[PDB]
Design a protein around this nucleic acid. Structure first.
Length: 108
RNA sequence: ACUGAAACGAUUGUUGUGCCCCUGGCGGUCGCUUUCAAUGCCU
């Protein structure tokens, strides 16, 4: 449904029968709660989020995190600044291309 | 039926339009066609 999923509901499917009138794709009732939780807690559009060209970065652990590191990664993923590459450029041609300069910039 | 069978990111499009290798410039300056010569010899 256009009111549930984050992208076009009605495009060609290899999973629906070929030449059939079932033109809408399927979603598990589980993934239907998940797409609605994404509308609710990321505040993204229904049926139209894909046109924002969304690319997702997932920050998986090196097997284990301590409780303080999961709290640190909370403070990041809910608080990270929307990156603009112009000043990341500026703070790196200044500082003589020492990449260690990036460690200190206001990323939050 | 290989999460299968068939599967064009395609169609159209001028690196375009204007533009003076331009302006100025003495082949110039100096230079004796010169030097020597019996219209001559006899009546």
């Amino acid at each position: 449904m256009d009111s549930v999923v984050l992208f076009k509901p009605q495009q060609y499917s290899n999973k629906n029968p070929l030449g059939g009138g079932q033109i809408k794709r399927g979603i598990s009732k589980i993934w239907s709660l998940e797409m609605l939780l994404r509308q609710a807690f990321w505040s993204v559009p229904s049926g139209k989020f894909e046109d924002q060209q969304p690319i997702f970065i997932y920050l998986y652990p090196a097997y284990v995190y301590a409780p303080q590191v999961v709290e640190a990664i909370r403070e990041l993923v809910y608080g990270i600044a929307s990156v603009n590459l112009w000043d990341v450029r500026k703070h790196w041609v200044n500082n003589k291309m020492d990449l260690t300069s990036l460690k200190s910039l206001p990323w939050l």
